[PDB]
Amino acid sequence: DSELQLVEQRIRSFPDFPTPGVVFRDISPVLKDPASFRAAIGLLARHLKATHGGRIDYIAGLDSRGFLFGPSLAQELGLGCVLIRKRGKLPGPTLWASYSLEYGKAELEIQKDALEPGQRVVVVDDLLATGGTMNAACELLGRLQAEVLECVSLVELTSLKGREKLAPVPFFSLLQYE
Amino acid sequence: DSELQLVEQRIRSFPDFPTPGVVFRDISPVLKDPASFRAAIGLLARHLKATHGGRIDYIAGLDSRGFLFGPSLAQELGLGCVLIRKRGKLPGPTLWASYSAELEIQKDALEPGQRVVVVDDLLATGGTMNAACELLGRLQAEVLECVSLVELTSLKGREKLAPVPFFSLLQYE
């Protein structure tokens, strides 16, 4: 797939960041090359349309790098984009969920009126690692009685078994690295 | 203008958030309504093309709410988007700038002389946009303009960025 190649060629890998042994996957060059960004959004949108048809109501973008892809993906599908944020950033009534991040805890948050019961959503972030962040997003959405059809990312680190963590919610990534 | 109205109708205000005194302007509904989002991006893109012609090389999006608009604005203009992030998030060699918190940019994000337009959701004191402009200036990039959806005029952020031009879709005190 030439389109997938346009994305893969623009992932930059940095060893030992932020800690020794970790390989950081930097999607910045995908954003910087308009053809690469367009290819990434197009591949995600084709997959989602082919898989879910007209069932998707909204895209949910995850703070902060998911924000880079959510609105463009939503626009390509003709849908709105709702936001899941780090706790403390959103006004009005919210729900929040705690999860493990590195050595400590972090918290995600969503406005109670972001979705109504029965609405169907697809969550997007740039990269799936342990799956902790995506799992918390799924939990929050479930508490609004929204149905999470799928989670998607550009990159998946398969050795961390994020896919299994999200089951039985389906997951799809453009690219995979150990 | 019906397009500008599509955006204005989707800004929600919250008094006394996050602390007493502050009136929070929430752009979330703009993102949730695909028509409103398209209108916002279109209005910004039309302004930038009419003002700069073909001179813009890149859009720079500011962490984190500027990330919601940067890539779509860049795409509409046929340009790439570079990222300015909260410090500690980017790999490789970086530069950073404080302001009353720290922003950061990769040393290789831009080449000297490249022309950039910075975007964020809202301009208030201008501290955040000013730090972004400083970082870009240290890469020897030329900042053509800064833009946002919302500007709080009583806080005089526009004066803070001068002489760099600024444009907002909507203004509140």
Ligand SMILES: Nc1ncnc2c1ncn2[C@@H]1O[C@H](COP(=O)(O)O)[C@@H](O)[C@H]1O
């Ligand atoms: N190796 C990596 N390279 C870049 N980002 C990563 C990496 N590992 C985790 N992340 C980020 O951390 C969050 C996901 O981590 P996790 O909750 O473990 O799936 C997302 O915001 C990812 O962007």
Ligand SMILES: Nc1ncnc2c1ncn2[C@@H]1O[C@H](COP(=O)(O)O)[C@@H](O)[C@H]1O
């Ligand atoms: N009243 C406000 N409502 C929503 N966001 C705000 C408000 N004031 C400041 N901000 C955010 O803070 C940054 C602008 O602050 P400043 O650096 O004072 O211009 C931007 O990232 C805005 O998203």
